[PDB]
Amino acid sequence: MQILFNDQAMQCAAGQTVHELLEQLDQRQAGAALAINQQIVPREQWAQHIVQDGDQILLFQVIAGG
C-alpha cells in the first residue's frame, strides 16, 4: 500500500489505521492532528481509522483552536 504523509509519498501496511500508519512510519502524536483524503480526523480515530493503499495524510502540530 502507499500513502501521502504531509505531501510525502510512502508505502505502508494497507488496512492499518493511522495509529497503525503513524506507528508504522515510526510516528506517534504528542499532540498531533492529521487530514487524510482531505478529511481532518481527530487523533483518537487514528486508532480506528483504518488506512487504505493510497492513504493521503495531512500533518497538524499540537491541537490548537482559537
N, CA and C atoms as an extended XYZ file, in Angstrom:
198
Properties=species:S:1:pos:R:3:atomname:S:1:resname:S:1:resid:I:1 pbc="F F F"
N         0.851       -1.222        0.000 N   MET     1
C         0.000        0.000        0.000 CA  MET     1
C         0.872        1.253        0.000 C   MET     1
N         0.280        2.378       -0.270 N   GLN     2
C         1.057        3.641       -0.266 CA  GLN     2
C         0.229        4.784        0.264 C   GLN     2
N         0.902        5.791        0.721 N   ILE     3
C         0.203        6.930        1.322 CA  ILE     3
C         0.907        8.234        1.022 C   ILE     3
N         0.320        9.295        1.449 N   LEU     4
C         0.976       10.590        1.303 CA  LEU     4
C         1.036       11.211        2.685 C   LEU     4
N         2.183       11.267        3.272 N   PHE     5
C         2.267       11.854        4.623 CA  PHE     5
C         2.826       13.276        4.527 C   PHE     5
N         1.994       14.266        4.674 N   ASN     6
C         2.480       15.667        4.560 CA  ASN     6
C         3.119       15.862        3.199 C   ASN     6
N         2.341       15.620        2.206 N   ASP     7
C         2.807       15.748        0.803 CA  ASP     7
C         4.019       14.840        0.573 C   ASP     7
N         4.204       13.859        1.420 N   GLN     8
C         5.342       12.898        1.230 CA  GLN     8
C         4.779       11.517        0.870 C   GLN     8
N         5.084       10.991       -0.280 N   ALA     9
C         4.518        9.651       -0.633 CA  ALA     9
C         5.174        8.544        0.201 C   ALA     9
N         4.453        7.483        0.452 N   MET    10
C         5.010        6.373        1.296 CA  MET    10
C         4.431        5.011        0.932 C   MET    10
N         4.977        3.977        1.520 N   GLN    11
C         4.399        2.621        1.340 CA  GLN    11
C         4.357        1.949        2.705 C   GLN    11
N         3.188        1.653        3.137 N   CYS    12
C         2.997        1.019        4.481 CA  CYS    12
C         2.016       -0.155        4.422 C   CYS    12
N         1.454       -0.498        5.551 N   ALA    13
C         0.507       -1.642        5.627 CA  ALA    13
C        -0.932       -1.223        5.323 C   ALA    13
N        -1.402       -1.482        4.135 N   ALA    14
C        -2.811       -1.119        3.806 CA  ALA    14
C        -3.766       -1.772        4.802 C   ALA    14
N        -4.753       -1.048        5.223 N   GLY    15
C        -5.739       -1.593        6.187 CA  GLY    15
C        -5.305       -1.228        7.605 C   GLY    15
N        -4.096       -0.769        7.751 N   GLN    16
C        -3.593       -0.380        9.095 CA  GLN    16
C        -4.095        1.028        9.457 C   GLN    16
N        -4.785        1.203       10.554 N   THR    17
C        -5.274        2.575       10.885 CA  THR    17
C        -4.141        3.582       10.842 C   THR    17
N        -4.441        4.740       11.331 N   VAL    18
C        -3.452        5.836       11.435 CA  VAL    18
C        -2.527        5.529       12.575 C   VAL    18
N        -3.099        5.298       13.731 N   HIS    19
C        -2.263        4.903       14.873 CA  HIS    19
C        -1.408        3.768       14.358 C   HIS    19
N        -1.945        3.087       13.375 N   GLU    20
C        -1.183        1.980       12.742 CA  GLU    20
C        -0.265        2.577       11.676 C   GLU    20
N        -0.746        3.567       10.967 N   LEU    21
C         0.087        4.220        9.918 CA  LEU    21
C         1.219        4.990       10.588 C   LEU    21
N         0.873        5.925       11.422 N   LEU    22
C         1.900        6.728       12.131 CA  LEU    22
C         2.893        5.809       12.816 C   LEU    22
N         2.402        4.933       13.633 N   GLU    23
C         3.323        3.995       14.333 CA  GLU    23
C         4.134        3.199       13.314 C   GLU    23
N         3.523        2.775       12.238 N   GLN    24
C         4.297        2.010       11.226 CA  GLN    24
C         5.390        2.910       10.675 C   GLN    24
N         5.028        4.110       10.330 N   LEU    25
C         6.017        5.075        9.811 CA  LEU    25
C         7.035        5.370       10.903 C   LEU    25
N         6.654        5.100       12.142 N   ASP    26
C         7.518        5.353       13.345 CA  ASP    26
C         7.157        6.716       13.915 C   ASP    26
N         5.910        7.076       13.811 N   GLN    27
C         5.471        8.392       14.334 CA  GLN    27
C         4.362        8.172       15.362 C   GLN    27
N         4.299        8.991       16.373 N   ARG    28
C         3.235        8.814       17.400 CA  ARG    28
C         2.275       10.008       17.359 C   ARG    28
N         2.272       10.835       18.370 N   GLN    29
C         1.362       12.015       18.364 CA  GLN    29
C         1.932       13.124       19.252 C   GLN    29
N         1.853       12.966       20.546 N   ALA    30
C         2.389       14.019       21.456 CA  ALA    30
C         1.640       15.315       21.238 C   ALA    30
N         0.514       15.244       20.613 N   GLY    31
C        -0.239       16.482       20.349 CA  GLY    31
C        -0.260       16.721       18.842 C   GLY    31
N        -0.751       15.783       18.081 N   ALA    32
C        -0.759       15.972       16.604 CA  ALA    32
C        -2.109       15.616       15.995 C   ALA    32
N        -2.483       16.319       14.969 N   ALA    33
C        -3.745       16.010       14.255 CA  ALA    33
C        -3.375       15.798       12.786 C   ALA    33
N        -4.208       15.169       12.004 N   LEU    34
C        -3.824       14.917       10.581 CA  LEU    34
C        -5.064       14.891        9.677 C   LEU    34
N        -4.903       15.187        8.411 N   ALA    35
C        -6.079       15.144        7.492 CA  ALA    35
C        -5.831       14.103        6.405 C   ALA    35
N        -6.639       13.084        6.334 N   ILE    36
C        -6.406       12.063        5.273 CA  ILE    36
C        -7.441       12.239        4.160 C   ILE    36
N        -7.027       12.183        2.927 N   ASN    37
C        -8.003       12.371        1.817 CA  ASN    37
C        -8.717       13.716        1.997 C   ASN    37
N        -8.094       14.619        2.713 N   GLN    38
C        -8.670       15.982        2.957 CA  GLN    38
C        -9.675       15.959        4.111 C   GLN    38
N        -9.903       14.829        4.722 N   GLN    39
C       -10.849       14.826        5.871 CA  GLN    39
C       -10.046       14.902        7.172 C   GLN    39
N       -10.106       16.013        7.854 N   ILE    40
C        -9.319       16.134        9.113 CA  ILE    40
C        -9.967       15.286       10.201 C   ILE    40
N        -9.288       14.263       10.628 N   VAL    41
C        -9.852       13.385       11.682 CA  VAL    41
C        -9.206       13.664       13.009 C   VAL    41
N        -9.973       13.487       14.026 N   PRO    42
C        -9.441       13.676       15.365 CA  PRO    42
C        -8.555       12.513       15.776 C   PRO    42
N        -7.364       12.852       16.102 N   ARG    43
C        -6.331       11.864       16.562 CA  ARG    43
C        -6.929       10.561       17.082 C   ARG    43
N        -7.739       10.651       18.086 N   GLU    44
C        -8.336        9.440       18.686 CA  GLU    44
C        -8.726        8.421       17.614 C   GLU    44
N        -9.381        8.862       16.581 N   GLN    45
C        -9.798        7.923       15.500 CA  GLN    45
C        -8.593        7.233       14.859 C   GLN    45
N        -7.462        7.886       14.789 N   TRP    46
C        -6.281        7.244       14.167 CA  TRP    46
C        -6.200        5.773       14.563 C   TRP    46
N        -6.614        5.462       15.747 N   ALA    47
C        -6.542        4.058       16.221 CA  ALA    47
C        -7.647        3.198       15.603 C   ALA    47
N        -8.680        3.808       15.107 N   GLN    48
C        -9.771        3.024       14.473 CA  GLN    48
C        -9.978        3.540       13.053 C   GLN    48
N        -9.079        4.369       12.601 N   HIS    49
C        -9.187        4.931       11.234 CA  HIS    49
C        -8.358        4.085       10.272 C   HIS    49
N        -8.842        2.922        9.931 N   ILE    50
C        -8.074        2.032        9.025 CA  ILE    50
C        -7.644        2.778        7.764 C   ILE    50
N        -6.384        2.694        7.482 N   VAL    51
C        -5.781        3.378        6.301 CA  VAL    51
C        -5.824        2.464        5.068 C   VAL    51
N        -5.950        3.022        3.891 N   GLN    52
C        -6.019        2.163        2.666 CA  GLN    52
C        -4.893        2.468        1.679 C   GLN    52
N        -4.468        1.487        0.920 N   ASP    53
C        -3.416        1.749       -0.086 CA  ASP    53
C        -3.796        2.984       -0.886 C   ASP    53
N        -3.050        4.007       -0.688 N   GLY    54
C        -3.321        5.308       -1.341 CA  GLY    54
C        -3.640        6.290       -0.219 C   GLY    54
N        -3.367        5.880        0.997 N   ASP    55
C        -3.656        6.733        2.179 CA  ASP    55
C        -3.034        8.122        2.077 C   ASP    55
N        -3.835        9.132        1.936 N   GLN    56
C        -3.287       10.517        1.900 CA  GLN    56
C        -3.324       11.084        3.317 C   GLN    56
N        -2.362       11.871        3.699 N   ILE    57
C        -2.371       12.389        5.094 CA  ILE    57
C        -1.923       13.851        5.195 C   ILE    57
N        -2.468       14.559        6.145 N   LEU    58
C        -2.043       15.964        6.395 CA  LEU    58
C        -1.489       16.016        7.823 C   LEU    58
N        -0.481       16.797        8.087 N   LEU    59
C         0.093       16.793        9.472 CA  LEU    59
C        -0.171       18.114       10.213 C   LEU    59
N        -0.751       18.037       11.390 N   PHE    60
C        -1.014       19.275       12.189 CA  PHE    60
C        -0.172       19.237       13.469 C   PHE    60
N         0.400       20.338       13.863 N   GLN    61
C         1.223       20.332       15.108 CA  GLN    61
C         0.379       20.762       16.317 C   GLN    61
N         0.324       19.945       17.343 N   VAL    62
C        -0.468       20.307       18.562 CA  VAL    62
C        -1.929       20.582       18.193 C   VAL    62
N        -2.818       20.391       19.127 N   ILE    63
C        -4.257       20.645       18.862 CA  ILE    63
C        -4.572       22.029       19.390 C   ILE    63
N        -4.522       22.994       18.536 N   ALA    64
C        -4.767       24.381       18.978 CA  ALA    64
C        -5.883       25.031       18.156 C   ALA    64
N        -6.902       25.518       18.805 N   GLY    65
C        -8.021       26.164       18.061 CA  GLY    65
C        -8.403       27.472       18.753 C   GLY    65
N        -8.608       28.516       17.997 N   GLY    66
C        -8.980       29.822       18.614 CA  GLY    66
C        -7.856       30.836       18.383 C   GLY    66
